UniProtKB/Swiss-Prot annotation:
Top EC group: transferase
Annotated binding of ATP, by residue: V27, G28, S29, G30, A31, Y32, G33, S34, V35, K50
Pfam families, sorted: Pkinase
Summary of the tissues where the protein is detected: Brain, heart, placenta, pancreas and skeletal muscle. Expressed to a lesser extent in lung, liver and kidney.
Organism: Homo sapiens
Gene responsible for this protein: MAPK14
TM region(s), chain numbering: none
Recorded catalytic activity of this chain's protein: L-seryl-[protein] + ATP = O-phospho-L-seryl-[protein] + ADP + H(+); L-threonyl-[protein] + ATP = O-phospho-L-threonyl-[protein] + ADP + H(+)
Name of the featured protein: Mitogen-activated protein kinase 14
Length: 350
């Protein structure tokens, strides 16, 4: 008893969606696919619909698409993009070739805010609080974001925030080259493949983000990998003996020991005028050694979030089986799996 679809040439492609979705307008296209805004007559919500482009053109692609669908279907938290609906005009696995994803329309990312507004210390408390709240949830499911940036953070007029972008194709080296904001928020360990990274990489991103909202400027706006690494070490000091031994890459560790030793600066003199509690939290987040970096759970209990902290209202996620990450299958099988997920989907209770 499927809906009734209608075709329409939006942007370079022909979107075929259920009748419930009207007034679709372009929002942006890319290798990932195409995104449209629309009004969901069945719920009265304004939504954003994404049509995946060539989801099963390769094994690497069919797998990515399965990953993204699995991630989005799993997310059930207020500060994390939830999946309101997912459909395909296809009537059987044989026809199956298109995938459409539907989620809330927030309206603006975090870049807009920090540009056309003035953030009080109270605002920074609320915004970062929600990022950390959603992060405690994500990490509790052994899920790593890996790419937290202001553009991956959606906010509405009420200043409520939702973390976005999961299971997206990794950034090409060209995308990480030069004076680009796509690298400014990454932790040094992944930016230079120092070791096997983990969730602590997101905490570093939050640090970079929180600093920007407080000062209104990018924390480590490097013109390239090396220049960015220098800006970092300049603030947090050069690696100690303990951190060097953890750097698996003999090449990277080699380049590091060639840099003149520098002491960790004084955050109080760097972030002048900032809430002393903000400064302290920033020192707990921006720690070069990832093992000693504060966790999201620990940060939420930090005095800087007293006004908002609520130990009974910061839920964790259910188990997320991602054993498929090390499974070797053919396009067809990844595709069939994706299809099963689409049909087994269950709309949010509301
Ligand atoms: O407000 C929202 N809500 C959801 C959303 N999802 C996406 S992608 C996407 C993912 C899952 C899904 F079900 C549905 C989805 F659409 C993008 C995109 C990410 C990459 N670039 C293109 C769009 C932008 C938004 N914006 C948005 C933001 Cl944060 C700022 C300005 C305008 C909008 Cl519509």
């Amino acid at each position: 008893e499927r809906p009734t679809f209608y075709r329409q040439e939006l942007n370079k492609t022909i979107w075929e969606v259920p009748e419930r979705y009207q007034n679709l307008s372009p929002v942006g296209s890319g290798a990932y696919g195409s995104v449209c805004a629309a009004f969901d007559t069945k719920t009265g919500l304004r939504v954003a619909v994404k049509k995946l482009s060539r989801p099963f053109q390769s094994i690497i692609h069919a797998k990515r698409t399965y990953r993204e669908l699995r991630l989005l279907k799993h997310m059930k938290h207020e500060n994390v993009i939830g999946l309101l609906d997912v459909f395909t005009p296809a009537r059987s696995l044989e026809e199956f070739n298109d995938v459409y994803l539907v989620t809330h329309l927030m309206g603006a990312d975090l870049n807009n805010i920090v540009k056309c507004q003035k953030l009080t210390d109270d605002h920074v408390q609320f915004l970062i609080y929600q990022i950390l709240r959603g992060l405690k949830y994500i990490h509790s499911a052994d899920i790593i974001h890996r790419d937290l940036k202001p553009s991956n953070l959606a906010v509405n007029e009420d200043c409520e925030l939702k973390i976005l972008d999961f299971g997206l194709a990794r950034h090409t080296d060209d995308e990480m080259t030069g004076y680009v904001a796509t690298r400014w928020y990454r932790a040094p360990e992944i930016m230079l493949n120092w070791m096997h990274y983990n969730q602590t990489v997101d905490i570093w991103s939050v640090g970079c983000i929180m600093a920007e909202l407080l000062t209104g400027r990018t924390l480590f706006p490097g013109t390239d990998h090396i220049d960015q690494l220098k800006l970092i070490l300049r603030l947090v000091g050069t690696p100690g003996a303990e951190l060097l031994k953890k750097i698996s890459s003999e090449s990277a560790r080699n380049y590091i020991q060639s840099l003149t030793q520098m002491p960790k600066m004084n955050f109080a003199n760097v972030f002048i005028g900032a809430n002393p509690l903000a400064v302290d939290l920033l020192e707990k987040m921006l720690v070069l050694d990832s093992d000693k970096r504060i966790t999201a759970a620990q940060a939420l209990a930090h005095a800087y979030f007293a006004q908002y902290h609520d130990p009974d209202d910061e839920p964790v996620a259910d188990p997320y089986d991602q054993s498929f990450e090390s499974r070797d299958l053919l396009i067809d099988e990844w595709k069939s799996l994706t299809y099963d997920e689409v049909i087994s989907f269950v709309p949010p209770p509301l």
